[PDB]
Amino acid sequence: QWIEILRIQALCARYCLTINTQDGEGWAGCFTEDGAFEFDGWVIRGRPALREYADAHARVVRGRHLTTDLLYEVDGDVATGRSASVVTLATAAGYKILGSGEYQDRLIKQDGQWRIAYRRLRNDRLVSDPSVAVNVADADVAAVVGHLLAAARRLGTQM
Template sequence: MTEAQTEALAEIHQRLAACTQAGDARKAEAYAACFAREGILELVNETIAGRTAILAWMKAPSVIPPSADGAAGFISHHLTTCHVDFTGPDSATVRTYWLVTSATGLDHNGYYIDKLVREEGEWLIAHRRPRTLWINAQSVLHAGN
């Protein structure tokens, strides 16, 4: 690994952590800023294209419904194994596994497939495709159902 790749790896890890923490805290501006101007968030049932659209999506009510009993809730993503493959001096593909905890404990898990690019001197997410592997029967994803 070159010195430039070592620096880029640290920057990419910081970007992924910033995106995760902003998403959990519903900090829409900080979350959207992790994406390239034309970045894409490809969800299972919806694709959101462009930083402006990602910002609007994050500002909308959460896709995780509030608890049926009105109890305060939280979700906390924990990034685990992360493999970065540099595809060029200003591009990389990344696969990162994650676990989500909530008041129920381990809530759900999965992975991100990300493509990052260096845009205006920063590593930003050009394309993110999250995939869920497992959901606890008591998950916040089922709240209100």
């Protein structure tokens, strides 16, 4: 059980290190063949689309994905859990916070290896206006947010 927790930590680390090094093949490889990444409600399903998403991401983003606060429950070859996500971005005005939120994950151990079946990212909203996109409020950041959202719209479907 403890070893599985360390394996899941390693998976989360590889998810960040692959996307942050523009390794879209490796990023998609963190998911099951038919796995999904959901953000801002758009569900991007399957390695082919996931790889396209990472490629689009690579064109417009440099920064760090930080995954911390990992809390997973494992039963046999399935696990679910949550973790905190903070994403930085390199801008001409310095390093800014592109994203802050929570991953909600369903993981599957298939033939020896943990992979992401479903990862939902929920980004934090204003307490007083859960309609406002906080990630577009700063202008440097806003253009990048636009590109990522556009990629999700071209590659996913909204539920």
